[PDB]
Write a protein that binds this ligand. Structure first.
Ligand SMILES: C=C(Oc1cccc(C(=O)O)c1)C(=O)O
Ligand SMILES: C=C(Oc1cccc(C(=O)O)c1)C(=O)O
Lengths: 284, 281
């Protein structure tokens, strides 16, 4: 029987927002310490919660609903301070005309759709008729007055489709910034609590390798954008702007934003407004 | 917009150094990579789920009109290969009429094993395909043909522990013919190679560059990989340096002779043509 130690099963968001991180993981050789699974953020959250992964990215709302069973990694997250570029409301009408209107919510999103609902309800005071559908701007704009998108589809709407067809595109990071002055965290990295307690060292090594890979990806953002531009509808300048607009930090100012958002949506989402975010402790 | 080529990659240790090279060079970010066992990756490439990938030799020969092989990279050996074995509780000349389990992930080594047992040792066993599991196989058969990590484990660990004979298929072929052996090649679908000659060529050159780097850094790869395997650093470095990743004239010589000896009993012409990706003139 092969009872040797097993590589941690690690999720990775397939979208462009984590493409520089993937570059870092590859260049550092970290990938060879992982059994990597790539997918969309809602699938990766399901897999980690149900035990198909040991460590991975968790969209914030799903992390908070499972906070007792997950341990978040400090100093890395998928966030913004102001615009995030890839979490948007695309609308054919001004936001204040959306009361009773149809608003399509992309099915891959858990956090941005809730942030959009919070903003529309509690900031602009409109109550639209929401519905979930697969992310497809063309179909959404044929059947609804507005749509909430994330990931590459949202970046495409923001940078290409929106300007082409004269559609308003509202940046959810900027809308939240205007409303609260705060940055925003859309997704965190976490280990399952049982995996973190069974393998504290591997969990720590995975965490440190993520930080190192993230740091390298920041230094080489131009090389990453140059390479990725050959395979995307976005050009090199757009991708480098995107990669540098994203904020991958996760310290005290970012936790402050998570705390406030969790408070405003917890009771109507599925977790306490004062839900406890447990962070992976460093070696003392 | 242009789409990344869909590229297969054998999940076994034999291509872990190559994966290291693909990551370190950044080549991985030009691929949409799929990892699986060699028989699955071969099926996927033939049926169009991949554009470029490793193809176990026998399956390449059965589909040679529709595949274009990459020169100067392959999975082979010159003598022992370490991870393609016959594990037997009896000497090979005592296997006539006995049950021999063929690991289901193999297409080439199982045929090479059959060729050796019939035409070199002159025994005709009762073959059957089953999942690779040395323990279950040794309870249900007198011998078993294994590849990949399972074969490497049998050769380096399980065999010596339980006193089981383990025959290296590369060495048996070398003894019989004096030739090296090629177990798998890399190929592009012909339709993909003709639609995207530049991408196909860049993928090929990136594979060569990554392979070369993996040879240069074999020790770091072994040190890292040993932390996740039952094999230690010295065993992995020995394995990685015993594998022969070349694919030039002497290796094609071996493919030609093997194809000749098994074609009529496998499912392709004995003189099947191996088309190679041509470099830019
Ligand atoms: C930066 C983004 O923000 C995210 C990331 C992951 C999940 C979600 C979600 O809404 O569930 C949002 C992006 O999508 O690019
Ligand atoms: C070096 C090996 O040889 C192979 C590689 C790929 C496929 C096959 C097969 O038999 O189909 C054999 C190994 O398995 O490690």
């Amino acid at each position: 029987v092969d009872n040797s130690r097993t590589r941690p099963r690690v999720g990775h968001i397939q979208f462009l927002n984590c493409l520089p991180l993937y570059w870092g993981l590859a260049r550092t050789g970290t990938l060879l310490d992982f059994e990597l699974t790539k997918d969309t953020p809602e699938k990766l959250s399901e897999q980690l919660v149900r035990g198909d992964l040991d460590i991975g990215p968790v969209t914030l709302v799903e992390f908070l609903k499972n906070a007792d069973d997950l341990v978040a990694f400090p100093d890395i997250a998928v966030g913004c301070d102001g615009p995030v570029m890839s979490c948007v409301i695309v609308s054919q009408v001004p936001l204040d005309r959306l009361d009773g209107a149809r608003v399509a919510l992309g099915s891959t999103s858990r956090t941005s759709v809730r942030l959009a609902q919070l903003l529309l309800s509690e900031r602009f005071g409109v109550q639209p008729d929401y519905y979930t559908c697969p992310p497809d701007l063309s179909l959404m704009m044929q059947e609804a007055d507005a749509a909430v998108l994330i990931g590459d589809a949202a970046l495409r709407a923001n940078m290409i489709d929106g300007p082409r067809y004269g559609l308003d595109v509202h940046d959810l990071g900027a809308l939240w910034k205007e409303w609260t002055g705060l940055p925003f965290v859309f997704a965190v990295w976490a280990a399952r609590r049982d995996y973190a307690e069974r393998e504290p060292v591997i969990t720590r090594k995975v965490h440190e390798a993520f930080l190192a890979s993230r740091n390298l990806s920041l230094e080489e953002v131009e090389k990453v954008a140059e390479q990725a531009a050959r395979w995307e509808a976005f050009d090199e300048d757009t991708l480098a702007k995107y990669f540098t607009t994203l904020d991958f930090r996760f310290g005290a100012p970012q936790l402050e934003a998570v705390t406030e958002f969790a408070r405003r949506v917890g009771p109507t989402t599925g977790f306490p407004a004062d839900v406890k975010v447990e962070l992976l402790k460093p070696l003392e």
